[PDB]
């Protein structure tokens, strides 16, 4: 999984209002992270490579003020 799960989750952003799926970037290790709801406010996550994120994910990242390009 991710190195810094809790803080990376807190500074994450919902990709679309129709889905609880969120996305963030680790300021420390630089990895891109996808988070999904488990139950309630609890979330799990996995690491992805830039090209494996969708347009919506990347849009919502750069526009969020999370990545240059």
């Amino acid at each position: 999984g991710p190195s810094n799960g809790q803080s990376v989750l807190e500074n994450s952003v919902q990709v679309k209002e129709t889905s609880p799926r969120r996305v963030s970037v680790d300021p420390q290790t630089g990895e891109f992270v996808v988070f999904d709801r488990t139950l309630g406010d609890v979330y799990h996550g996995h690491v992805r490579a830039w090209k494996d994120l969708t347009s919506d994910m990347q849009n919502a990242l750069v526009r969020g003020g999370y990545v240059d390009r």
Binding site: V8, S19, D36, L39, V42, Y43, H46
Partner: protein
């Protein structure tokens, strides 16, 4: 505040009992243990589907199981792509799981068809 939980590994042998008898957090844990740690597509896909299709389980759990099918697809090279796709597409019309179906399909299309 949102809470990160990395899935615990539940031994394969205990899974079916947890899915029969378990409370929701137990069941979610089983689904996620499958999603993150089991390598046998057929064995795992079968079990996730039984949760996803079970009308006596709450929407939260059914939706999670679909998301978990998304995780399997991401991870496992030898999935049956056509079976995974027909499954996810067959849910697009019912709302309890639609949203997770869409994101599981994103997972399928990226990791296994691109």
């Amino acid at each position: 505040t949102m809470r990160y939980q990395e899935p615990a590994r539940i031994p394969n042998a205990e899974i079916d009992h947890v899915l029969a008898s378990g409370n929701p957090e137990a069941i979610a844990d089983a689904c996620l243990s499958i999603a993150y740690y089991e390598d046998d597509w057929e064995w795992a896909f079968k079990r996730l589907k039984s949760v996803a299709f079970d009308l006596n389980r709450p929407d939260s759990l059914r939706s999670l199981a679909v998301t978990c099918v998304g995780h399997l697809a991401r991870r496992i090279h030898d999935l049956d792509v056509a079976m995974a796709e027909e499954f996810l597409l067959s849910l697009g019309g019912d709302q309890a799981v639609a949203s997770a179906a869409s994101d599981a399909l994103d997972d399928l299309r990226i990791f296994r068809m691109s």
